[PDB]
Amino acid sequence: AWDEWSPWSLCSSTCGRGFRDRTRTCRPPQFGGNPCEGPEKQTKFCNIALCP
Numbered sequence: 001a002w003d004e005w006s007p008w009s010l011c012s013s014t015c016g017r018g019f020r021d022r023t024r025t026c027r028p029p030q031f032g033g034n035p036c037e038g039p040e041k042q043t044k045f046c047n048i049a050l051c052p
């Protein structure tokens with residue numbers, strides 16, 4: 001089982017296309033659990049302003 005996501009980062013670009021990301025680690029293993037392979041990162045597109 002997965003632990004909670006971290007907050008999203010800010011957009012890596014202050015204008016134009018960039019990335020934002022967040023990460024999570026595994027919860028401690030339990031008897032019978034499906035093994036979790038950690039850490040995991042989620043990345044998405046962002047664009048916060050048009051560049052000059």
Ligand SMILES: *[C@@H]1O[C@@H](C)[C@@H](O)[C@@H](O[C@@H]2O[C@H](CO)[C@@H](O)[C@H](O)[C@H]2O)[C@@H]1O
Pocket residue numbers: 013014015016049051
């Ligand atoms: C963040 O604020 C924006 C309003 C711009 O001033 C950014 O500077 C511009 O950033 C782009 C993308 O990294 C570069 O291509 C330009 O060289 C730069 O003027 C600022 O980082």
Ligand SMILES: *[C@H]1O[C@H](CO)[C@@H](O)[C@H](O)[C@@H]1O
Pocket residue numbers: 003004005024
């Ligand atoms: C991260 O993603 C969402 C919150 O944005 C929820 O499913 C849960 O908090 C998860 O850790």
Ligand SMILES: *[C@H]1O[C@H](CO)[C@@H](O)[C@H](O)[C@@H]1O
Pocket residue numbers: 006007008022
């Ligand atoms: C990232 O995205 C939103 C805020 O933009 C929230 O669900 C939370 O802050 C998450 O980390």
